[PDB]
């Protein structure tokens, strides 16, 4: 993975040693070259993972997440240009340095072969993420959002640190390949009930699990656009990727320990989908939408069926591009009206015909219109949960109805009706904004042709 | 006033000075080259060559091979009267069940 780690690090010298007026051009161009080379990670074999060295490996689960991570960095640089156009040159480069250092940690996190190395890099993404929110956030609440984002993750992570080190002493190694062969079943005892919770609650809070999500409406709303894209597209998937790994060493205790979290997830997604029907803030509505889609992933990982693990991988990648696109669309409006209220600017389809086309495609994939990979992942999880229990079809179906209601409600309030009379500065959509939306939706709709590359190791 | 603070600046519409602006930068020279790198490296390279690269992956996940192998075994077993597929993946002779 040194062929991606080293180039990413070289983006820091490139930014600091480039001309004053070329920091965006040079960082965007070279971060796109890095994304192009990540396609070499698709050399996946049907029996064995692609094991590079003692430190790093890449199977069919890490590869789609790695390509998504390296693809977002240039998109994050396009989004941030407007609101950083009038900031001190050194601080513009510090902002970019934070994004690069965040990509550096992520790709090493998704490829670490040893769980303690995974934990360090999993836990290292907090520092650059917190700095982005609190320093370059726009509101006063950004300071309270960082603390919520910080102590929710750490409150769950620190127990995970104890559990991981405990497992190494007992097993003798945290290397994932070793655990695949030396794993022993987990006896049903009170001691193992709290081993299981320690290994999972760290990853639950990042998904997030309903109940432990109050940090997400704060961190995804008070952060800049570049922060909101990585937060919702990738950083929520560190929880999903973690559970997809650590549940190997938690059987058969997951059979009964998953009940409280399945109920919180099955019922939680109805609750959070309903919240989206009455949200007065457009960005906050998108944040609450993430909790509902990530509730399907938690259920998908906790039932442990091949159809559920294929759905979870597709759902994470699918929601990664859709959630990022929605934040960008909501941000294009904000850069004109400078307010997050949903009911302030209306009928925008009359003034921005092409940007409303992106709104339609963003909403259609959000409500899982087939044959989009959004529907493929959600469909696979529904089939897997039906076999788990036929009654779950009621909750899954109800969420599909509510999901389509708030998705189109967001599309009808801002893109239809009558334009707000007193808003007279809705300038035509820039090429930067239009290209930002294409780079989301176009790769999202292409994966439908060959979806096997986002279906994970169990394909 | 409670302090000496600059009044809040008004927003700058990049269309006013450069009606051909692509939204990337105030400088027209930088603005055009910002757009070219995004489009060429984003659309002409990653999406088009990446799409072609993914389309021609050399038998991703060994799925095409397993189809040929299944055909070879099905032909072999049907030509000798053996069952198409047995209920035991491992020969019981190597298994030593308790007591």
């Amino acid at each position: 993975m040194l062929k991606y780690i080293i180039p990413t690090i070289m983006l820091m010298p490139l930014t600091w040693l480039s001309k004053n007026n070329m920091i965006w051009v040079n960082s965007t161009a070279h971060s796109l070259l890095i994304s192009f080379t990540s396609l070499l990670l698709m050399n996946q074999f049907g029996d064995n993972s692609l094991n590079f060295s003692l430190l790093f490996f890449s199977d069919s689960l890490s590869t789609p997440l790695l390509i998504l991570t390296m693809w977002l960095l240039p998109l994050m640089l396009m989004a941030s240009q407007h609101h950083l156009s009038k900031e001190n040159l050194t601080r513009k480069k510090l902002f970019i340095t934070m994004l690069i250092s965040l990509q550096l940690f992520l790709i090493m996190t998704f490829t670490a072969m040893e769980l303690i190395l995974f934990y360090i890099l999993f836990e290292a993404t907090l520092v650059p993420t917190l700095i982005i929110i609190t320093r370059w956030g726009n509101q006063t609440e950004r300071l309270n959002a960082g603390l919520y984002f910080l102590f929710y993750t750490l409150a769950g992570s620190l127990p995970l640190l104890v559990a991981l080190i405990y497992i190494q002493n007992t097993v003798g190694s945290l290397n994932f390949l070793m655990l695949q062969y030396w794993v022993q079943p987990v006896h049903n005892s009170w001691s193992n009930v709290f081993m299981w919770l320690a290994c999972m609650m760290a990853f639950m809070v990042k998904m997030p699990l309903y109940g432990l999500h109050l940090w997400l409406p704060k961190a995804h709303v008070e952060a800049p656009i570049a922060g909101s894209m990585v937060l919702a597209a990738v950083l929520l998937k560190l929880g999903g990727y973690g559970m997809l790994r650590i549940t190997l060493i938690l059987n058969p205790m997951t059979d009964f320990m998953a009940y409280p979290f399945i109920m919180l997830s099955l019922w939680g997604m109805i609750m959070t989908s309903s919240i989206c029907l009455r949200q007065t803030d457009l960005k906050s509505l998108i944040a609450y939408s993430s909790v509902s889609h990530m509730a399907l992933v938690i259920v998908a990982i906790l039932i442990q069926t091949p159809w559920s693990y294929m759905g979870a991988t597709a759902l994470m990648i699918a929601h990664g591009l859709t959630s990022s696109m929605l934040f960008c669309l909501a941000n294009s409006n904000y850069e004109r009206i400078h307010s997050r209220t949903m009911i302030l600017a209306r009928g925008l389809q009359t003034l921005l015909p092409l940007m409303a086309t992106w709104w339609l495609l963003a909403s259609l994939t959000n409500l899982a219109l087939p044959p989009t990979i959004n529907l493929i992942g959600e469909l696979f999880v529904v089939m897997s949960t039906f076999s788990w229990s036929n009654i779950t079809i009621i909750l899954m179906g109800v969420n599909m109805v509510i999901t389509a209601l708030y998705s189109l409600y967001m599309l009808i309030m801002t893109q239809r009706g009558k334009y707000t009379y007193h808003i007279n500065n809705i300038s035509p959509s820039f090429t930067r904004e239009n290209a930002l939306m294409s780079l989301h939706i176009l790769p999202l709709l292409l994966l439908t042709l060959n979806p096997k590359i986002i279906l994970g190791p169990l394909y | 006033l409670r302090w000496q603070e600059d009044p809040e600046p008004e927003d700058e519409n990049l269309y006013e000075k450069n009606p051909d602006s692509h939204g990337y930068d105030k400088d027209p020279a930088v603005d055009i080259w910002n757009m070219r790198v995004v489009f060429f490296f984003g659309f002409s390279i990653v999406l088009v060559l990446g799409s072609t690269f993914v389309a021609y992956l050399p038998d991703y996940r060994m799925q095409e091979w397993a189809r040929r192998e299944a055909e070879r075994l099905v032909k072999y077993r049907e030509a000798h009267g053996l069952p198409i597929m047995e209920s035991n993946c491992f020969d019981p002779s190597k298994i030593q069940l308790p007591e």
Binding site: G137, T140 | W3
Partner: peptide, 19 residues
């Protein structure tokens, strides 16, 4: 609008003997 930065009201919370 413009990014928010602390005013005198916010800072004087940290000027007392205790928090």
């Amino acid at each position: 609008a413009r990014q928010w930065q602390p005013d005198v009201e916010w800072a004087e919370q940290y000027g007392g003997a205790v928090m």
